[PDB]
Amino acid sequence: EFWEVDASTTTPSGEALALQVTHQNDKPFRPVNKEQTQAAVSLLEKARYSVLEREDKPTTSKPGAPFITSTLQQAASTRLGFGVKKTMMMAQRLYEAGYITYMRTDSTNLSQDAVNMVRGYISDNFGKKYLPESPNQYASKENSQEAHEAIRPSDVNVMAESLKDMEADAQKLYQLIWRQFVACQMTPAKYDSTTLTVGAGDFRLKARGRILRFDGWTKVMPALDRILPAVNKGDALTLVELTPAQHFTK
Amino acid sequence: FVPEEFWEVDASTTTPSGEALALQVTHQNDKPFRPVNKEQTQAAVSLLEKARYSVLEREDKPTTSKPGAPFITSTLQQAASTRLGFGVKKTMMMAQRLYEAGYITYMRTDSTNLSQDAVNMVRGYISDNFGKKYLPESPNQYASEAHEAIRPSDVNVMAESLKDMEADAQKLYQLIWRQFVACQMTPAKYDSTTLTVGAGDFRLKARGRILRFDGWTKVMPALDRILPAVNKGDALTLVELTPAQHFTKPP
C-alpha cells in the first residue's frame, strides 16, 4: 500500500485551487503507511504555501458546430439527461410550434439569414472581441434554399424563457439548441494550458489544467483539462484542507 | 487542522462503455457508513473488494446555488480566515482600519440588513456591469446593535484604488466588496446527476453537476464533474477502493 495527499487551498483573490502533494525533500512523495502520512500532514498543516512556478502553453478552444440530429441527442443526454426518445419528442414539439428548424438533419449548414441574424445578436449583446471577422463555417458546401440546415432557433431574439407555452423539458432543450447556435458563431475561448508548482516547507505540490484568458463562446455555452484560477509565481496560497488517502498496488 | 469525525471510502470503477466512474460508500447493512478509525475502514474494503457492483438508480435534476448573505462580523472573520488566511485579530484590525477610513460600514454587527440605498446602489452596479440574467427581478433579503451588514460605503470604489490602506486591508475590502455585490446577484444554476450503486451489503453514490449559469459566482468564486452514462441494472468494473480522511482548518 501507499498513500497520496491532496490539498485544497485558496488563491490570493480567494479562489479555490486543488493540488496534489508530489514531492517531499525534492523526491517523490509516497508514504507507505498511515503513520508516515499523518506526520506529513502535520508538517503540511504548518507550512507556508507559495507558487514556485507557472508554466504556460497558449491554447484556444473553438466553438462546436450547430446541432444536427446526432449531436443534439448526445448533448441532450449529457447536459440534460434526456434519452433519445424524449429528445426527439421535445424537438418535434419545438419544431411544430415553429420555434426551431427541422429536427431530422445531418447537415451543419446555416442559411445566410441565420448567420446574419446571429452575428447581429452577438454584435448587439457582446463586446467586439466576441465576433469573428468572418462567419464560422462547418461542413463544406454553402446554403441554397431547399438545402439542409442545422437544428437552430427560428429567431435568436427568442429565449427559452419566453416559451411560456412549451413544457419544462422543451424549454430546456430549446435553451440548449439556442446556446449551441449562438456560440457556434462566436470567437474561440483562449486559455493557458498550465502546470502550477507550489512549495510548502519541504514539500512540492502541483496542479495541471488550464487558466482562462478569454471566455469567448463559453460566455453563452459553458464548456464541459480543468479550469484553474489564475495565479502568478510568488503568490501566496491559504491551506484550507488536506486529504490523505490510502491506495493499494493490487 | 481538524480531522473529520468519520473516514470515507471511495471506489474507482468503470461502466459498461469503459468510462471512469468515481463512487463514495454511503451505507453498510442499510445504515449510514461512518467508520471512526482507519481499522474499520480496512474491514469495509475487504468486503467491497469481493462484491458485485450494480447501478440501482440514476437521477437528473436542475439545482441552484443561491448567494450567501452580506457579511456580519462572525461570517467575515470566517471568510477572511478561509479565503485570506487572516486570524480574527488581524481581520478585525484591518476592518477597524477600513471603517475609520470610511470605506466600509461598521464592522461589529450581527445584522444582515442592507439599506434601501445600499441595495439600489449595488443593483445599479450589477445592471451596468453584467447581463440582465445577473440581476434578480426583486432584491435579495436575508434572515437575521449595528442594524446593517458589513459592506462597502461605495460600490464604485474598488479595493485597488483605495489609498493609504495597506495590502491586507485592501484585500479584506475586496472580499467584503465581492460578498456584497454577489449577495444581490442571481443564483448559479446546474444540472445535477445522482447515481446510486449497490455492492454486497453496501450502497454507494456518485454526484455530478454541470454548470448552466454562473450567476453570482462570476464575481465571488464558490468554494462537480460530468458523470458517464450508465443505467439502472448496469454492472460496473471495480478498479480500486480508497479509504480517506479529511483534515480541515479549524474555525
Ligand SMILES: [Zn+2]
Ligand atoms: Zn441529405
